[PDB]
Amino acid sequence: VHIDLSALNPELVQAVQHVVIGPSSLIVHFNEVIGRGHFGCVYHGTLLDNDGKKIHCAVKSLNRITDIGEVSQFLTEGIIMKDFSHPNVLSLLGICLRSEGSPLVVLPYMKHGDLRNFIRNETHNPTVKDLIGFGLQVAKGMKFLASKKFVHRDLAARNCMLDEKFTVKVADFLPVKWMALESLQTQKFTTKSDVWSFGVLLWELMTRGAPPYPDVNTFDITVYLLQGRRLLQPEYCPDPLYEVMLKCWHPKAEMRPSFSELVSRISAIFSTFIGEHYVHVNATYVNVK
Ligand SMILES: O=C(Cc1ccc(F)cc1)NC(=O)Nc1ccc(Oc2ccnc3[nH]ccc23)c(F)c1
Numbered sequence: 001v002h003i004d005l006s007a008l009n010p011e012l013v014q015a016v017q018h019v020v021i022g023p024s025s026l027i028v029h030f031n032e033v034i035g036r037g038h039f040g041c042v043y044h045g046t047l048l049d050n051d052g053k054k055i056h057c058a059v060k061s062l063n064r065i066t067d068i069g070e071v072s073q074f075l076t077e078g079i080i081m082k083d084f085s086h087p088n089v090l091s092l093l094g095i096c097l098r099s100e101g102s103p104l105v106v107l108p109y110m111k112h113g114d115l116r117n118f119i120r121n122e123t124h125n126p127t128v129k130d131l132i133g134f135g136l137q138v139a140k141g142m143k144f145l146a147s148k149k150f151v152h153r154d155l156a157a158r159n160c161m162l163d164e165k166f167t168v169k170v171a172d173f174l175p176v177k178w179m180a181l182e183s184l185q186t187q188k189f190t191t192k193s194d195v196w197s198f199g200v201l202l203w204e205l206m207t208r209g210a211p212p213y214p215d216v217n218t219f220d221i222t223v224y225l226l227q228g229r230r231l232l233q234p235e236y237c238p239d240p241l242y243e244v245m246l247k248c249w250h251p252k253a254e255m256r257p258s259f260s261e262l263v264s265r266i267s268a269i270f271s272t273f274i275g276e277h278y279v280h281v282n283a284t285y286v287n288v289k
Pocket of ligand 1: 034042058080089090091107108110112113145152161170171172
């Protein structure tokens with residue numbers, strides 16, 4: 001590589017070598033990619049853990065240049081997950097270190113991709129229990145992150161991964177439609193504002209991926225909310241769960257339930273179901289963006 005890297009920041013990007021995986025225990029399949037965005041070239045990959053022992057994963061690579069800046073963010077955006085060790089939070093397997101260019105960020109591969117798409121798929125047959133369970137898992141992930149003073153900022157069904165055992169992992173690939181009033185007013189985000197977002201996530205779940213507030217100009221959703229509105233109760237959403245969304249949307253940020261109380265309340269509601277209520281999509285929501 002022809003970039004001066006040690007000009008980086010030892011104390012800033014300290015410990016990228018603490019979670020390093022020797023350029024051997026990992027294998028990349030540059031011919032099969034799954035990531036498409038303004039940035040983010042993710043290909044399927046296999047990394048042999050321990051000494052057996054093949055593990056399927058998603059490798060995060062970067063595009064040559066620019067200077068030491070893009071290299072700094074990419075790495076920093078990887079050390080963000082270093083300590084994130086919770087079954088409902090998307091973790092970092094490691095970062096492989098080779099030269100000649102791009103560095104690698106390795107994530108556990110997720111068979112079912114993102115939550116929103118999984119639920120929108122007409123061939124899937126979720127029950128109220130299934131959907132509430134996904135919501136309970138997200139809450140458990142958030143309770144973990146909140147314990148670590150980590151403010152997500154973009155909690156939403158599109159940012160949650162679903163793995164082969166159907167384990168939801170909170171992740172992150174302006175989302176004003178998921179934002180609390182006070183944050184729409186002052187672009188300041190807190191744990192209490194992630195709760196507002198969680199409520200909206202619960203709604204996406206109960207409607208099976210419908211877009212919230214389809215009719216409103218997206219621009220000012222604030223004037224809309226201030227009129228005294230909230231998302232309507234989805235057909236298959238149990239009354240008690242709807243009372244929870246209404247609590248997550250409390251006008252006073254501090255009156256909102258914490259993620260611990262949410263785990264408690266939702267787990268109760270979840271226990272009452274046996275899996276005998278199938279959830280269908282509302283005709284008026286189908287094909288809506
Ligand atoms: O999510 C983060 C940081 C983070 C982690 C947890 C948080 F709560 C908040 C932020 N890092 C990412 O790089 N996110 C991400 C999320 C999804 C990604 O794409 C996949 C990864 C594994 N399996 C997949 N199947 C389809 C896409 C896919 C991906 F490459 C990266």
